[PDB]
Each structure stands twice: as C-alpha cells, then as structure tokens.
Amino acid sequence: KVFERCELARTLKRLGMDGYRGISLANWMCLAKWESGYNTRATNYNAGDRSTDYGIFQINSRYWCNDGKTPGAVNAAHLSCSALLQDNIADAVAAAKRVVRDPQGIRAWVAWRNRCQNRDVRQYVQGCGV
C-alpha cells in the first residue's frame, strides 16, 4: 500500500511514534518519505553485502528481520522480513522502534542524515491534524 501523507501521519501518531526515544513524528515522516515514498511493499537488494531493505522504513535484513538468505545476519526485531511488507504497518513500527533503541537512534538510517537532519521537517506533518 502507498500511503497518502496525512493518513500515514495519523497512523504513526496512533502507533505511538511521536517523540519515541526523543524522535518527533515529523522525523519519522521524513524518514519514510525518502526511504520508500510511503510504500509498504518497497524492497531494495544491496548487491554489495547480500542484504535487503524491507518496507516503509527500509529495514535491513542483516540486523533486524530474518529473510534466511542474508549471510551473517541477526534478527534483532525477531520478525520474518515478510512482516515488513504488509499493508498494516504495526510490525514495521515495532521493528523501527527496536532499531532506535540502539545508541545510534534515528541516525541508523543514512538517508535520515542526508535528507532530514538539521532541516525544517515540519512540512511532512503540516495540515495533518497531528
């Protein structure tokens, strides 16, 4: 499913992402936007290390979910990567929360650093009623 911007914002708020581990909703919005364009079925194969990024937040199979085919992987979120391709983002949000519980926080995603850090991200939540 490809979410509309405000529909996603409200969904994430309900799922408790606003201020999760000090990260504002607008940051999560910025992250989903650049990682998948709000698309839950997005997948990106990293030929370089044989890992794959899954879902709306592009969560990597080397550390967070199990896809069986990634060498040297762990499944820190303890989920099948298949769970990150559902239209219902409940599992993807639980996985994203697990990723930020590590010391790096939101910086774990390089796209966040490039596209959201030290930027005016209010644009992502404007007019959504959140």
PDB file of C-alpha atoms in Angstrom:
ATOM      1  CA  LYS A   1       0.000   0.000   0.000  1.00  0.00           C
ATOM      2  CA  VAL A   2       1.162   3.529  -0.830  1.00  0.00           C
ATOM      3  CA  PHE A   3       0.076   5.825   1.993  1.00  0.00           C
ATOM      4  CA  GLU A   4      -1.118   9.388   1.474  1.00  0.00           C
ATOM      5  CA  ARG A   5       0.982  11.796   3.649  1.00  0.00           C
ATOM      6  CA  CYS A   6      -1.555  12.801   6.336  1.00  0.00           C
ATOM      7  CA  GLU A   7      -3.082   9.278   6.523  1.00  0.00           C
ATOM      8  CA  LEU A   8       0.373   7.993   7.447  1.00  0.00           C
ATOM      9  CA  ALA A   9       0.982  10.819   9.960  1.00  0.00           C
ATOM     10  CA  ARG A  10      -2.212   9.920  11.883  1.00  0.00           C
ATOM     11  CA  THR A  11      -1.425   6.222  11.690  1.00  0.00           C
ATOM     12  CA  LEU A  12       2.079   6.753  13.154  1.00  0.00           C
ATOM     13  CA  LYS A  13       0.700   9.010  15.904  1.00  0.00           C
ATOM     14  CA  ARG A  14      -1.793   6.285  16.921  1.00  0.00           C
ATOM     15  CA  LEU A  15       1.051   3.712  16.979  1.00  0.00           C
ATOM     16  CA  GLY A  16       2.936   5.906  19.463  1.00  0.00           C
ATOM     17  CA  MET A  17       5.812   7.153  17.257  1.00  0.00           C
ATOM     18  CA  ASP A  18       5.574  10.828  18.247  1.00  0.00           C
ATOM     19  CA  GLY A  19       8.618  11.513  20.478  1.00  0.00           C
ATOM     20  CA  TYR A  20       9.554   7.805  20.623  1.00  0.00           C
ATOM     21  CA  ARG A  21      13.066   7.732  22.080  1.00  0.00           C
ATOM     22  CA  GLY A  22      13.127  11.539  21.523  1.00  0.00           C
ATOM     23  CA  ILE A  23      12.227  11.391  17.798  1.00  0.00           C
ATOM     24  CA  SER A  24       9.417  13.704  16.637  1.00  0.00           C
ATOM     25  CA  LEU A  25       6.682  12.464  14.268  1.00  0.00           C
ATOM     26  CA  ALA A  26       7.961  14.818  11.539  1.00  0.00           C
ATOM     27  CA  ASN A  27      11.337  12.977  11.592  1.00  0.00           C
ATOM     28  CA  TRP A  28       9.638   9.589  11.130  1.00  0.00           C
ATOM     29  CA  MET A  29       7.620  11.100   8.246  1.00  0.00           C
ATOM     30  CA  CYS A  30      10.786  12.497   6.640  1.00  0.00           C
ATOM     31  CA  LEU A  31      12.413   9.060   7.000  1.00  0.00           C
ATOM     32  CA  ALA A  32       9.520   7.062   5.394  1.00  0.00           C
ATOM     33  CA  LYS A  33       9.291   9.641   2.609  1.00  0.00           C
ATOM     34  CA  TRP A  34      12.918   9.283   1.483  1.00  0.00           C
ATOM     35  CA  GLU A  35      13.257   5.605   2.233  1.00  0.00           C
ATOM     36  CA  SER A  36      10.233   4.232   0.323  1.00  0.00           C
ATOM     37  CA  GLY A  37       7.961   7.100  -0.729  1.00  0.00           C
ATOM     38  CA  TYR A  38       5.428   5.818   1.874  1.00  0.00           C
ATOM     39  CA  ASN A  39       5.290   2.388   0.118  1.00  0.00           C
ATOM     40  CA  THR A  40       4.928  -0.713   2.349  1.00  0.00           C
ATOM     41  CA  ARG A  41       5.936  -3.145  -0.405  1.00  0.00           C
ATOM     42  CA  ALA A  42       9.269  -1.440  -1.214  1.00  0.00           C
ATOM     43  CA  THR A  43      12.269  -3.773  -1.281  1.00  0.00           C
ATOM     44  CA  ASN A  44      15.857  -2.882  -2.225  1.00  0.00           C
ATOM     45  CA  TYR A  45      18.560  -5.523  -2.745  1.00  0.00           C
ATOM     46  CA  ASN A  46      22.111  -4.419  -1.706  1.00  0.00           C
ATOM     47  CA  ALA A  47      24.292  -6.408  -4.127  1.00  0.00           C
ATOM     48  CA  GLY A  48      27.315  -5.239  -2.160  1.00  0.00           C
ATOM     49  CA  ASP A  49      26.626  -7.203   1.050  1.00  0.00           C
ATOM     50  CA  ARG A  50      23.746  -9.509   0.018  1.00  0.00           C
ATOM     51  CA  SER A  51      21.260  -7.893   2.426  1.00  0.00           C
ATOM     52  CA  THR A  52      17.806  -6.495   1.575  1.00  0.00           C
ATOM     53  CA  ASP A  53      15.893  -3.429   2.866  1.00  0.00           C
ATOM     54  CA  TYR A  54      12.209  -4.076   3.504  1.00  0.00           C
ATOM     55  CA  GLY A  55       9.060  -1.986   3.759  1.00  0.00           C
ATOM     56  CA  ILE A  56       8.085   1.540   4.509  1.00  0.00           C
ATOM     57  CA  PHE A  57      11.138   2.268   6.683  1.00  0.00           C
ATOM     58  CA  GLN A  58      13.542   0.103   4.579  1.00  0.00           C
ATOM     59  CA  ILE A  59      14.631  -2.089   7.499  1.00  0.00           C
ATOM     60  CA  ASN A  60      17.727  -4.190   6.790  1.00  0.00           C
ATOM     61  CA  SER A  61      17.842  -7.969   6.887  1.00  0.00           C
ATOM     62  CA  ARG A  62      21.419  -8.157   8.221  1.00  0.00           C
ATOM     63  CA  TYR A  63      20.254  -6.997  11.650  1.00  0.00           C
ATOM     64  CA  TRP A  64      16.565  -6.562  12.119  1.00  0.00           C
ATOM     65  CA  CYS A  65      14.426  -9.199  10.433  1.00  0.00           C
ATOM     66  CA  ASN A  66      15.025 -12.724   9.138  1.00  0.00           C
ATOM     67  CA  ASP A  67      14.871 -13.464   5.383  1.00  0.00           C
ATOM     68  CA  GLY A  68      17.041 -16.621   5.602  1.00  0.00           C
ATOM     69  CA  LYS A  69      19.256 -15.696   2.606  1.00  0.00           C
ATOM     70  CA  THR A  70      21.330 -12.940   4.198  1.00  0.00           C
ATOM     71  CA  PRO A  71      24.798 -14.045   5.285  1.00  0.00           C
ATOM     72  CA  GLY A  72      25.896 -13.347   8.848  1.00  0.00           C
ATOM     73  CA  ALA A  73      22.548 -11.870   9.823  1.00  0.00           C
ATOM     74  CA  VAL A  74      20.771 -11.430  13.105  1.00  0.00           C
ATOM     75  CA  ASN A  75      17.040 -10.720  13.573  1.00  0.00           C
ATOM     76  CA  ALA A  76      17.152  -8.177  16.407  1.00  0.00           C
ATOM     77  CA  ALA A  77      13.466  -7.289  15.912  1.00  0.00           C
ATOM     78  CA  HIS A  78      12.695 -11.035  15.905  1.00  0.00           C
ATOM     79  CA  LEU A  79      10.393 -10.957  12.883  1.00  0.00           C
ATOM     80  CA  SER A  80      10.199 -12.555   9.437  1.00  0.00           C
ATOM     81  CA  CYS A  81      11.111  -9.793   6.901  1.00  0.00           C
ATOM     82  CA  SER A  82       7.791 -10.833   5.252  1.00  0.00           C
ATOM     83  CA  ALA A  83       6.088  -8.999   8.164  1.00  0.00           C
ATOM     84  CA  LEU A  84       7.517  -5.716   6.867  1.00  0.00           C
ATOM     85  CA  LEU A  85       5.729  -5.995   3.537  1.00  0.00           C
ATOM     86  CA  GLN A  86       2.145  -5.986   4.912  1.00  0.00           C
ATOM     87  CA  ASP A  87      -0.328  -3.120   4.281  1.00  0.00           C
ATOM     88  CA  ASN A  88      -0.801  -2.996   8.079  1.00  0.00           C
ATOM     89  CA  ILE A  89       2.338  -1.258   9.448  1.00  0.00           C
ATOM     90  CA  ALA A  90       2.039  -2.425  13.083  1.00  0.00           C
ATOM     91  CA  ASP A  91       5.023  -4.845  12.798  1.00  0.00           C
ATOM     92  CA  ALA A  92       7.123  -2.322  10.776  1.00  0.00           C
ATOM     93  CA  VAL A  93       6.574   0.274  13.504  1.00  0.00           C
ATOM     94  CA  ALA A  94       7.596  -2.259  16.201  1.00  0.00           C
ATOM     95  CA  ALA A  95      10.768  -3.004  14.172  1.00  0.00           C
ATOM     96  CA  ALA A  96      11.521   0.722  13.684  1.00  0.00           C
ATOM     97  CA  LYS A  97      11.136   1.228  17.465  1.00  0.00           C
ATOM     98  CA  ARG A  98      13.628  -1.612  18.073  1.00  0.00           C
ATOM     99  CA  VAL A  99      16.191  -0.043  15.658  1.00  0.00           C
ATOM    100  CA  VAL A 100      16.145   3.305  17.524  1.00  0.00           C
ATOM    101  CA  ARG A 101      16.593   1.672  20.935  1.00  0.00           C
ATOM    102  CA  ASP A 102      20.252   1.163  19.845  1.00  0.00           C
ATOM    103  CA  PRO A 103      22.680   4.032  20.622  1.00  0.00           C
ATOM    104  CA  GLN A 104      22.633   5.458  17.045  1.00  0.00           C
ATOM    105  CA  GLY A 105      18.879   6.221  17.262  1.00  0.00           C
ATOM    106  CA  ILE A 106      17.439   7.631  14.030  1.00  0.00           C
ATOM    107  CA  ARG A 107      20.964   8.167  12.645  1.00  0.00           C
ATOM    108  CA  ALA A 108      20.984   4.394  11.957  1.00  0.00           C
ATOM    109  CA  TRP A 109      19.438   5.372   8.608  1.00  0.00           C
ATOM    110  CA  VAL A 110      21.901   7.262   6.411  1.00  0.00           C
ATOM    111  CA  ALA A 111      19.003   8.655   4.372  1.00  0.00           C
ATOM    112  CA  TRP A 112      17.866  10.453   7.581  1.00  0.00           C
ATOM    113  CA  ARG A 113      21.293  12.119   7.880  1.00  0.00           C
ATOM    114  CA  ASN A 114      21.291  13.179   4.240  1.00  0.00           C
ATOM    115  CA  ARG A 115      17.690  14.287   3.916  1.00  0.00           C
ATOM    116  CA  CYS A 116      16.213  15.137   7.314  1.00  0.00           C
ATOM    117  CA  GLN A 117      18.881  16.027   9.892  1.00  0.00           C
ATOM    118  CA  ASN A 118      19.193  19.751  10.573  1.00  0.00           C
ATOM    119  CA  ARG A 119      16.374  20.545   8.150  1.00  0.00           C
ATOM    120  CA  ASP A 120      12.932  22.076   8.555  1.00  0.00           C
ATOM    121  CA  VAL A 121      10.860  18.839   8.626  1.00  0.00           C
ATOM    122  CA  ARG A 122       7.553  20.472   9.707  1.00  0.00           C
ATOM    123  CA  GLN A 123       6.500  20.246   6.037  1.00  0.00           C
ATOM    124  CA  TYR A 124       5.866  16.497   6.426  1.00  0.00           C
ATOM    125  CA  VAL A 125       3.154  16.938   9.097  1.00  0.00           C
ATOM    126  CA  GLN A 126       1.643  20.326   8.119  1.00  0.00           C
ATOM    127  CA  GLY A 127      -2.135  20.208   7.860  1.00  0.00           C
ATOM    128  CA  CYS A 128      -2.450  16.614   9.069  1.00  0.00           C
ATOM    129  CA  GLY A 129      -4.121  17.378  12.402  1.00  0.00           C
ATOM    130  CA  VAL A 130      -1.422  15.623  14.411  1.00  0.00           C
TER     131      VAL A 130
END
